[PDB]
Design an enzyme around this catalytic site. Structure first.
Site, PDB file in Angstrom:
ATOM      1  N   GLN D  11       0.832  -1.200   0.000  1.00  0.00           N
ATOM      2  CA  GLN D  11       0.000   0.000   0.000  1.00  0.00           C
ATOM      3  C   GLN D  11       0.868   1.251   0.000  1.00  0.00           C
ATOM      4  O   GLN D  11       0.529   2.254  -0.639  1.00  0.00           O
ATOM      5  CB  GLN D  11      -0.981   0.016   1.176  1.00  0.00           C
ATOM      6  CG  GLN D  11      -0.388   0.156   2.565  1.00  0.00           C
ATOM      7  CD  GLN D  11      -0.116  -1.176   3.221  1.00  0.00           C
ATOM      8  OE1 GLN D  11      -0.020  -2.204   2.555  1.00  0.00           O
ATOM      9  NE2 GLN D  11      -0.035  -1.169   4.544  1.00  0.00           N
ATOM     10  N   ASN D 206      11.800   7.543   7.222  1.00  0.00           N
ATOM     11  CA  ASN D 206      10.668   8.433   7.479  1.00  0.00           C
ATOM     12  C   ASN D 206      10.981   9.571   8.445  1.00  0.00           C
ATOM     13  O   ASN D 206      10.460  10.676   8.272  1.00  0.00           O
ATOM     14  CB  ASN D 206       9.482   7.635   8.021  1.00  0.00           C
ATOM     15  CG  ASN D 206       8.687   6.968   6.927  1.00  0.00           C
ATOM     16  OD1 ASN D 206       8.737   7.385   5.771  1.00  0.00           O
ATOM     17  ND2 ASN D 206       7.941   5.929   7.282  1.00  0.00           N
ATOM     18  N   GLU D 254      23.917   5.231 -16.507  1.00  0.00           N
ATOM     19  CA  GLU D 254      25.037   5.987 -15.945  1.00  0.00           C
ATOM     20  C   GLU D 254      24.856   6.218 -14.449  1.00  0.00           C
ATOM     21  O   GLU D 254      25.031   7.332 -13.957  1.00  0.00           O
ATOM     22  CB  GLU D 254      25.176   7.318 -16.676  1.00  0.00           C
ATOM     23  CG  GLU D 254      25.212   7.213 -18.185  1.00  0.00           C
ATOM     24  CD  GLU D 254      25.377   8.561 -18.860  1.00  0.00           C
ATOM     25  OE1 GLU D 254      25.464   9.580 -18.143  1.00  0.00           O
ATOM     26  OE2 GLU D 254      25.417   8.602 -20.108  1.00  0.00           O
TER      27      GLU D 254
HETATM   28  N1  LIG Z   1       6.991   7.030   3.935  1.00  0.00           N
HETATM   29  C1  LIG Z   1       5.948   6.208   3.914  1.00  0.00           C
HETATM   30  N2  LIG Z   1       6.037   4.955   4.494  1.00  0.00           N
HETATM   31  C2  LIG Z   1       4.976   4.114   4.475  1.00  0.00           C
HETATM   32  C3  LIG Z   1       3.792   4.513   3.872  1.00  0.00           C
HETATM   33  N3  LIG Z   1       2.911   3.500   3.992  1.00  0.00           N
HETATM   34  C4  LIG Z   1       3.506   2.480   4.650  1.00  0.00           C
HETATM   35  N4  LIG Z   1       4.781   2.846   4.978  1.00  0.00           N
HETATM   36  C5  LIG Z   1       5.751   1.979   5.681  1.00  0.00           C
HETATM   37  O1  LIG Z   1       5.364   0.633   5.467  1.00  0.00           O
HETATM   38  C6  LIG Z   1       5.626  -0.135   6.617  1.00  0.00           C
HETATM   39  C7  LIG Z   1       4.680  -1.330   6.720  1.00  0.00           C
HETATM   40  O2  LIG Z   1       4.369  -1.852   5.445  1.00  0.00           O
HETATM   41  P1  LIG Z   1       3.008  -1.387   4.723  1.00  0.00           P
HETATM   42  O3  LIG Z   1       3.297  -0.509   3.532  1.00  0.00           O
HETATM   43  O4  LIG Z   1       2.152  -0.645   5.719  1.00  0.00           O
HETATM   44  O5  LIG Z   1       2.220  -2.714   4.256  1.00  0.00           O
HETATM   45  P2  LIG Z   1       2.857  -3.807   3.262  1.00  0.00           P
HETATM   46  O6  LIG Z   1       4.298  -3.490   2.954  1.00  0.00           O
HETATM   47  O7  LIG Z   1       2.051  -3.860   1.991  1.00  0.00           O
HETATM   48  O8  LIG Z   1       2.731  -5.205   4.046  1.00  0.00           O
HETATM   49  P3  LIG Z   1       1.400  -5.597   4.859  1.00  0.00           P
HETATM   50  O9  LIG Z   1       1.304  -4.706   6.074  1.00  0.00           O
HETATM   51  O10 LIG Z   1       1.487  -7.038   5.300  1.00  0.00           O
HETATM   52  O11 LIG Z   1       0.187  -5.398   3.985  1.00  0.00           O
HETATM   53  C8  LIG Z   1       5.487   0.828   7.785  1.00  0.00           C
HETATM   54  O12 LIG Z   1       6.424   0.505   8.784  1.00  0.00           O
HETATM   55  C9  LIG Z   1       5.787   2.190   7.192  1.00  0.00           C
HETATM   56  O13 LIG Z   1       7.084   2.582   7.583  1.00  0.00           O
HETATM   57  C10 LIG Z   1       3.695   5.769   3.287  1.00  0.00           C
HETATM   58  O14 LIG Z   1       2.647   6.132   2.750  1.00  0.00           O
HETATM   59  N5  LIG Z   1       4.781   6.610   3.307  1.00  0.00           N
HETATM   60 MG   LIG Z   2      -0.817  -3.664   3.851  1.00  0.00          MG
END
Ligand SMILES: Nc1nc2c(ncn2[C@@H]2O[C@H](COP(=O)(O)OP(=O)(O)OP(=O)(O)O)[C@@H](O)[C@H]2O)c(=O)[nH]1
Ligand SMILES: [Mg+2]
Ligand SMILES: Nc1nc2c(ncn2[C@@H]2O[C@H](COP(=O)(O)OP(=O)(O)OP(=O)(O)O)[C@@H](O)[C@H]2O)c(=O)[nH]1
Ligand SMILES: Nc1nc2c(ncn2[C@@H]2O[C@H](COP(=O)(O)OP(=O)(O)O)[C@@H](O)[C@H]2O)c(=O)[nH]1
Ligand SMILES: Nc1nc2c(ncn2[C@@H]2O[C@H](COP(=O)(O)OP(=O)(O)O)[C@@H](O)[C@H]2O)c(=O)[nH]1
Lengths: 51, 95, 430, 439, 433, 430
Positions: D11, D206, D254
């Protein structure tokens, strides 16, 4: 100096024209061009389309 | 008249800054939104404002944002321009 | 008669040729549609040197443009006088070398060079009497540094008796736009020293320094650098296209400027150049021309010419002037700077005069000087090379595409030997 | 005639892909409906949008990118949103069951049944393009599905296409902040998987961007969208060289010839300048020297890492706007003259500078203002080892007592697969310290 | 190509900075909103071009009390100043020099030094630093000491000049101000190139006697100080027949490095109701300037010997009149110079007349004089401050408030013997050979 | 032929040159655009003495302007006749000396003088037949008093046979504008006495007295002083540029006015000088000219010439006149003032005649007198120097930039010895 206010206020304004060249050469008397004028800083540019 | 919105590094109180969110924008916009009242007030939501979630409440549309931003700029500058003359400012009595 | 063809490769070569042809076009009075509109009769007598005649009375340069990416050529098609180039000469790749010497010299360049070699052979066979070739490149790019030098080798293998000129933009650490500059520079120099009949180095640091202090213009640009380079380029070959008191072709320059076959690396200079503010303020005379000529700061390279001794010098004057004044001024300068001239070869200055000045200027001067002061650039390039090579940095790309570190060791040894044998003659005494 | 293919998973990956995609459409003039405007009826030239789009023959343009997720909520939102008419209906690949932060589920249980369709769509792209420059991958590492699917895609693609270039914009877990509790496990496993499978990886932590926003943008309560906008601007400026005319061009190929000295060491860290909002942006000139100084300033970093604690190998700066090359070189001279920033004994020259004429584009409702000069730097230095060391410590804290291990044991992963990842990280730590010493 | 950087710390510092910058903006013609009203690099002395439109003053404000900063950023000059150069902390030192020197100032001095680096990198011909601070206040004094000691090692030979406001012999607001005044004097003695007297009661008498306002305020003080500053700095940005630079103060006016405390007078001071009825001759304005009662320092020049005086004359003054007035001044017997100084007058001439501010008291005049002098008579303020501090340190009053904030007990002592050594240095210099 | 270049440094020197070149241009009929507009043929025959030719037919003053601050030159460039100067001759610093001899002679000046020395060498080599050099400077400013004298030493080291002229403005104790004047005045005199071939002292107090008493104008100004100094300068070199009955070049003046090599300090004067309200009634005659040239108040120095005995005197007349009258008037003046003339060298008066008078005047006189009365200025300068130095005040400024008190002691001892040996010949009898 570059007049920065004009390029801020007139950057999105672009004029596109369809034009035909006039020249002594007869090979390139029929081909067409698209001209662009960017009034941000008075830039004139020409595009040549090939059918 | 003040000016509406404040300089970024402004210490002080800007009314309902902690009560009703205003998360996401720069800071000047939040100050402007608060000084000229455009937000809901109160701990309740009429049907229309709710169910408009971030990517559905924003991150969308097109050039309507052009219109609103242009109107805000125009109104803020026409409010500001109400000062002129070759007599500097009455900061002697403002201080 | 005794004409030459232009061959340019890479972004730097293409953009240098882009305004070299513009300067030549302005000098010869040709319109951008190929219609002659000059004023003097002398503008057409030697037009065959750089232009071929076509039906309808138009002229086309003998220019061959090559690259492994088509963007630079599609962009030079847009510049002024860009509609003079014959479209078939444009040869472009579909992948790009990615600043990789191995990609530009072993796999993709070797496969691509077939068509450009065919067209170069066609051009060389077409001309009435071939004089030589001039090739322009920069050592900071992979595709250039590989493909250009491989084509130099291939052309030398087929035409051993013809002359070869190379217009080399070497990467200096001050203007460092790439971290892999010295790998490619050393690898290109290793092949170039063997095949190039003449090479002249140009430094962007020197170009910008000239722009700020000599012209005193606040915003130097790529256009200004290219214009200076093009003026220097045309100053060499002006005498071959225009009459003069003492004609001196590129072969005569090769005879008189290269004492030993491996010492063929030069630095140049152009005069006069002044700000708009001092254009009316200054006066155009032979003493002023020679003092701006022989100034250490006026050199087209960042190397300091007072840190060594000049092996030989060559001068090309443009404009109508007395030869006695030129000779006495050169004698006076050679007497006043005897400490900076090698002693075991007397009269190491060559003079040439052409009666046709450049358009807009009454007098002009081109200096080409072979001196031992050029060792500093090679020394610093080799220092950077050995620094980056001691820890085997960035060598995985080079080793994964067919070439090994033994070639690197051989190139470094050859470059160090070249530096040592170039500085050996500096300390030689009679 | 040059193309680049983007893949997004998780996501976080999908909401950063959307974030870069409105910006690409804005800078290319693309309306949400796919027509340029309805007002401009000449067009038919300046083909640069092919870098991210492909012409339909008449009218709209389709994305050259894929969205992947096993959690269909985000894909449903996207196909409902105002860009529903832009993306191809079948190119938003969505599963049924989320991996729920389990790398085992996403790498051994449910990702295999979806990776086939993903590879099919990848081929259905690759056949259309002719001058593919490379691949970009976006994935959140702190999530099981993202990590597993990214690892699987890299593993299959490395043999499917072989030598083609891939760049991965990874977002490692924070040094001491976490939204989950089991992220060290899957992060370490994914790092072990991608080490030998990605050509270049880039740090996107982050808290660094949080500090950037609070200090520069003066936003005391930012949300994830602002971070997405900044990352989108970074990657757009990165790709601007391939679609905009520049007197000093740089290509995707590059990159690791200039920033990656050993094939194993390919983790990069990025900084940006300037970051300023409109009400005080116009107050100063924003000179090239000062924007370069701000870019190299350690606190202006998008990764929670201290460059002063590590030794620099090589940096690439890229400028967009009306910058002057000799002003650039004068700034580089001042950087070299500066003492606290040092370049390693085996790399005297370490600057890879590119120049582009197109100024950055301003986004509606965004934080950044419109400027005529921007610099972005991508650096390799030995300071990277601290995040790896701390992550190793956290992972060891759990692997000491075998906590949460059954959640990976019962999903097809054998017990020992934590080991080779552990010794892999340890070996890379000794490799980093070995590279960091002088001759 | 020449620039100078100004620092204002404390309530008094920020209030005098407002007065100086209003006069500067008026004399350079720049609008209060910062945009040029429209019409030659002179504005580069104090301001920096943004490229198109507004300008940026080369000034910084530091304070821990955000009231004055908020007032400034809400006033008419909100658009003029850069948002993040008016540094405001949280908790005031509350007249406690230890609070501003060892507890709170350290967490803000880093940001201030970063701002100084950012502003100095823009300047290429930086002449030096000017600092304004109320020493009789805790936060101002502590921040001044910290900034001086940091800059002395950050740059070194760069000139720094401080316009200090020492307490009056009898009239004061604070009661703990002797302690922090002594400590700050001890700190700045070996860290400030030039220190200038700005005591309050003297200008009070000036305003009452000449401006004929029986009920003036601090803003009048600040405007007079602003006029003095503009006079002493006009030479850098205005053409003159005999120019004087900032570097031409420590090369003419500091005979020994320890003696760098300097006292200044100005003329003419008259309201518009009677300004035009006198020809305002150069001789009489010079006589008024050297007149002891026209002094902005409550000191008697008659009680001490003179070392070196520098006058700046702005307007249509003529050097023949300059020398004629100097000859008469030397002729008078009531003013005597030290034996080892045959000539001690340094004259500068500028063509730009002073600019009159609307709503002010001073009228428009075609001639003005500002004199900056080193004389031996200054020692009385140090002696009385020493007595004031001794009367308290005898019974160790107020000491716990400083002990409990990070300072050790004896740190008053070295300041005491430093004042004593500075005194005996004054008398040793004051004796003839 | 026998031409000289101009070199000026410091604010006072720049102001003096700004009027000197204006006076020369007005005399030669040169417009501020560099275009000749004279009426007589003789105005162009010997214009190469001060003017060089440029393309387009324009003329240039070969004057080199140097300073450690650019304000004075950026101000004089906008003044009348300011466009004649080539911009290349302008050399300026970015720091300034702050009226400090240490900064003007040791730290900044030594590094800065390279470019001005290069341009001075170029100018000296360019001219056909070099006669010598002339410098104008004030001793009250540190940067001038340092850089000018160091340049004097450097030029003397390279051209030992050429002649040196210096116009030195010394700080008088009456009109004092700087508190550190004695220190740098002594430091400048110590170096100047060793290298200067001729020095002419000019006093602002004496100029102001002349303006108040002779011209009787209400408000004297620096413009009037510069005009008087410029007229005095032009009177010396008028005879070298215009024909006359008895030509006498600067070398002849050096031979005839300096008996001993260390006695080369002179005081000068110009005649006639009358008020605007008193021009008709006075009749221009040789007796009036001589009674005015020998007047004590007409001297440009506050030193009283009747407090000592003249070692030698020289007079240059401008205008067509009989030589017998000049000789008989000189004999009468020498006979009537035998008490004020040294007795062991008879006929210590030299006379020269030029047939071209100044524009607007029918006859003119320039007087240069070497007398023993100049000791008073050195005595008072030394008294002030020792009074200020006995208490080591104002000294750490100089000692912190490389110098020491031993140099000051040596300078004071040398000045005292010079004064003693200058007054020794006053009491000498045959
Ligand atoms: N900078 C930033 N980090 C994000 C964002 N969304 C999720 N994260 C990071 O993603 C990590 C967790 O993974 P998620 O993206 O929430 O979900 P996933 O990687 O698809 O895996 P699942 O949770 O099992 O669905 C968190 O610890 C956040 O640090 C975002 O919109 N911006
Ligand atoms: Mg997820
Ligand atoms: N001349 C002048 N003096 C001032 C001004 N403001 C304050 N002072 C003096 O400063 C003294 C007290 O210090 P303040 O300036 O009020 O406060 P501070 O310097 O910031 O230090 P703190 O007291 O710790 O806040 C008073 O006794 C005043 O004499 C001013 O505007 N002009
Ligand atoms: N004169 C000039 N030199 C340039 C210009 N652009 C780049 N260069 C120089 O060319 C070198 C880089 O060449 P590069 O582009 O990598 O060559 P390529 O790989 O063959 O395209 C650098 O040293 C630059 O200084 C230009 O517009 N004018
Ligand atoms: N005749 C004349 N004298 C001047 C002029 N300007 C300054 N002076 C004298 O020069 C002295 C100061 O010299 P200064 O400016 O310090 O010299 P600098 O340090 O080389 O610039 C003063 O005492 C003045 O009397 C001028 O325009 N004409």
């Amino acid at each position: 100096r570059k007049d920065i206010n004009k390029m801020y206020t007139q950057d999105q304004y672009i004029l596109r024209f369809e034009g035909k060249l006039i020249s002594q050469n007869k090979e390139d008397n029929h081909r067409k061009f698209i001209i662009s004028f960017f009034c941000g800083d008075d830039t004139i540019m020409v595009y040549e389309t090939a059918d | 008249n003040q000016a509406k919105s404040h300089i970024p590094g402004y210490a002080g109180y800007i009314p309902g800054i902690r009560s009703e969110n205003m998360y996401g924008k720069t800071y000047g916009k939040i100050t402007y939104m608060s000084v000229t009242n455009q937000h809901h007030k109160g701990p309740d939501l009429p049907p229309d404002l709710r169910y408009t979630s971030t990517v559905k409440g924003e991150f969308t549309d097109q050039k309507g944002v052009k219109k609103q931003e242009l109107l805000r700029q125009a109104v803020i500058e026409e409010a500001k321009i109400t000062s002129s003359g070759y007599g500097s400012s009455p900061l002697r009595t403002k201080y | 008669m005794r004409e030459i063809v232009h061959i340019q490769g890479g972004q730097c070569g293409n953009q240098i040729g882009a305004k070299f042809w513009e300067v030549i076009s302005d000098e010869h009075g040709i319109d951008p549609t190929g219609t002659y509109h000059g004023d003097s009769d002398l503008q057409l007598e030697r037009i065959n040197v750089y232009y071929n005649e076509a039906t309808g009375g138009r002229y086309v340069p003998r220019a061959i443009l090559m690259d492994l990416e088509p963007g630079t050529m599609d962009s030079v098609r847009a510049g002024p006088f860009g509609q003079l180039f014959r479209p078939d000469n444009f040869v472009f790749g579909q992948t790009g070398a990615g600043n990789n010497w191995a990609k530009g010299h072993y796999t993709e360049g070797a496969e691509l060079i077939d068509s450009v070699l065919d067209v170069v052979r066609k051009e060389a066979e077409g001309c009435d009497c071939l004089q030589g070739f001039q090739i322009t490149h920069s050592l900071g790019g992979g595709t250039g540094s590989g493909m250009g030098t491989l084509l130099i080798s291939k052309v030398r293998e087929e035409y051993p008796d013809r002359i070869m000129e190379t217009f080399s933009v070497v990467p200096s650490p001050k203007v460092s736009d790439t971290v892999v500059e010295p790998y490619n520079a050393t690898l290109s120099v290793h092949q170039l020293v063997e095949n190039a009949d003449e090479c002249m180095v140009i430094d962007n640091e020197a170009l910008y320094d000239i722009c700020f202090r000599t012209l005193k213009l606040t915003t130097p640009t790529y256009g200004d650098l290219n214009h200076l380079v093009s003026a220097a380029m045309s100053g060499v070959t002006c005498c071959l296209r225009f009459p003069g008191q003492l004609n001196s072709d590129l072969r005569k320059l090769a005879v008189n400027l290269i004492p030993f076959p491996r010492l063929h690396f030069f630095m140049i200079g152009f005069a006069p150049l002044t700000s708009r503010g001092s254009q009316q303020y200054r006066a155009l005379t032979v003493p002023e021309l020679t003092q701006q000529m022989f100034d250490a700061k006026n050199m087209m390279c960042a190397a300091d010419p007072r840190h060594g001794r000049y092996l030989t010098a060559s001068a090309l004057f443009r404009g109508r002037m007395s030869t006695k004044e030129v000779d006495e001024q050169m004698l006076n300068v050679q007497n006043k700077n005897s400490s900076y001239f090698v002693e075991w070869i007397p009269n190491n200055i060559k003079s040439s005069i052409c009666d046709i000045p450049p358009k807009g200027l009454k007098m002009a001067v081109t200096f080409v000087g072979n001196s031992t002061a050029i060792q500093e650039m090679f020394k610093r390039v080799a220092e950077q090379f050995t620094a980056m090579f001691r820890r085997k940095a960035f060598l995985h790309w080079y080793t994964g595409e067919g070439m090994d570190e033994m070639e690197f060791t051989e190139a470094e040894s050859n470059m160090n030997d070249l530096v040592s044998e170039y500085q050996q003659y500096q300390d030689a005494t009679a | 005639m040059r193309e680049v293919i983007s893949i997004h998973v998780g996501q976080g990956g999908i909401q950063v892909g959307n974030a870069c995609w409105e910006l690409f459409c804005l800078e290319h003039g693309i309306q949400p409906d796919g027509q340029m405007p309805s007002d401009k009826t000449i067009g038919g030239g300046d083909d640069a949008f092919n870098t991210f789009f492909s012409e339909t023959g008449a009218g709209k343009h389709v994305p050259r990118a894929v969205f992947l997720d096993l959690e269909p909520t985000v894909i449903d939102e996207v196909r409902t949103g105002t860009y529903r008419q832009l993306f191809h209906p079948e190119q938003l690949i969505s599963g049924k069951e989320d991996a729920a932060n389990n790398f085992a589920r996403g790498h051994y249980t449910i990702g295999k049944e979806i990776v086939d369709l993903c590879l099919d769509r990848i081929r259905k792209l690759a056949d259309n393009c002719t001058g593919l420059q490379g691949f970009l991958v976006f994935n959140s590492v702190g999530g099981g599905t993202g990590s597993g699917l990214g690892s699987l895609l890299l593993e299959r693609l490395s043999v499917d296409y072989g030598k083609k270039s891939k760049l991965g914009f990874t977002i490692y877990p924070s040094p001491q902040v976490s939204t989950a509790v089991v992220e060290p496990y899957n992060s370490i496993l994914s790092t072990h998987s991608l080490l030998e499978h990605t050509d270049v990886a880039v740090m996107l932590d982050n808290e660094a961007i949080y500090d950037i926003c609070r200090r520069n943008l003066d936003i005391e309560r930012p949300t994830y969208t602002n971070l997405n906008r900044l990352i989108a601007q970074v990657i757009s400026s990165l790709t601007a060289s391939l679609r905009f005319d520049g007197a000093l061009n740089v290509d995707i190929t590059e990159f690791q010839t200039n920033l990656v000295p050993y094939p194993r060491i390919h983790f990069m860290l990025s900084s940006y300048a300037p970051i300023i909002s409109a009400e005080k942006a116009y107050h100063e000139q924003l000179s090239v020297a000062e924007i370069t100084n701000s870019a190299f300033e350690p606190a202006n970093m998008m990764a929670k890492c201290d460059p002063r604690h590590g030794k620099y190998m090589a940096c690439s700066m890229m400028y967009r706007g009306d910058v002057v090359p000799k002003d650039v070189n004068a700034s580089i001279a001042t950087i070299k003259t500066k003492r606290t920033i040092q370049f390693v004994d085996w790399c005297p020259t370490g600057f890879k500078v590119g120049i582009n004429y197109q100024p950055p584009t301003v986004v509606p409702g965004g934080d950044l203002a419109k400027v005529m000069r921007a610099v972005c730097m991508i650096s390799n230095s030995t300071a990277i080892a601290e995040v790896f060391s701390r992550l190793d410590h956290k992972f060891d804290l759990m692997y000491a007592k075998r906590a949460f291990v059954h959640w990976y044991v019962g999903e097809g992963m054998e017990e020992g697969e934590f080991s080779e990842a552990r010794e892999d990280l340890a070996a890379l730590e000794k490799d980093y310290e070995e590279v960091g010493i002088e001759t």
